Design a protein around this ligand. Structure first.
Ligand SMILES: Cc1cccc(O)c1
Ligand SMILES: Cc1cccc(O)c1
Ligand SMILES: Cc1cccc(O)c1
Ligand SMILES: Cc1cccc(O)c1
Ligand SMILES: Cc1cccc(O)c1
Ligand SMILES: Cc1cccc(O)c1
Ligand SMILES: [Cl-]
Ligand SMILES: [Zn+2]
Ligand SMILES: [Zn+2]
Lengths: 30, 21, 29, 21, 30, 21, 29, 21, 29, 21, 30, 21
């Protein structure tokens, strides 16, 4: 797995891939 | 939060799964 | 099971633009 | 859900904004 | 809808989504 | 132009539809 | 109507790389 | 158009550059 | 030949995240 | 290859990491 | 073809498109 | 390398095909 800043859409799709069937939850900025 | 940790800093895979369901 | 996984990549990505900060939830079942 | 409704047929941004928050 | 700089490809796909069936026109830099 | 307005600045949805057909 | 919409997302995106500044038009019908 | 020609079968960059400008 | 080309765009993209620096190879046949 | 194995059915990140390096 | 910095994923997909059937090889940072 | 040439600088199409197989 990459050592990169992940930002914006690149974050969402990555979570998309990292969670798979569990799914996920993006709050954007907290 | 996800963003403050993995955008304005870098995130492990592990640190990223915290945000799974 | 691809064409609903490849499809969700386009969906997740579009939710990000449309909701922005509000955020969203992506799960089912 | 969204997959059944947006993958079969296209959703518009407006419909997609139903799955927000 | 997001409050973000949209740049490059991220601009095109967003317009893609914002216009839908109307379609669109990208000139890049003017 | 689109780019000068929505990349080197931020753009509303509304400001973005100006660039539809 | 998905597989031609999801497909156009890949097309629009590729036109952007290939034309760059020249720009393009994405409409039909 | 492009959709009929690039979605059914693959276009190459070269073909796609026909729909430019 | 689209649905395996459009599909490889999603694959190549995912390999990039998963391998990062290690790198990869994308060819067949 | 990967196309036959990841395009027909979904691969997970773990499977995809078999095609690395 | 664009005159842009291409980075990260944007690099891979572009090569994806530039090589077509030949395919390619990404090393990331060398 | 690809990255040092086409990310931290800009790359022609030609300069990009060097990295094909
Ligand atoms: C529709 C669906 C099923 C399983 C996981 C998901 O994130 C979404
Ligand atoms: C923008 C978008 C992507 C994928 C499916 C849809 O219905 C809409
Ligand atoms: C082919 C097609 C139909 C309708 C809208 C578009 O942007 C493109
Ligand atoms: C690069 C690309 C994307 C989608 C369809 C095509 O024919 C080619
Ligand atoms: C599977 C396959 C065939 C031809 C070219 C590629 O890059 C990959
Ligand atoms: C993430 C991903 C994309 C495309 C196909 C797959 O099997 C998995
Ligand atoms: Cl970016
Ligand atoms: Zn990007
Ligand atoms: Zn796709």
């Amino acid at each position: 797995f990459v050592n990169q800043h992940l930002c914006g859409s690149h974050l969402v799709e990555a979570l998309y891939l990292v969670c798979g069937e569990r799914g996920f939850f993006y709050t954007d900025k907290t | 939060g996800i963003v403050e940790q993995c955008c304005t800093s870098i995130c492990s895979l592990y640190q990223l799964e915290n945000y799974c369901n």
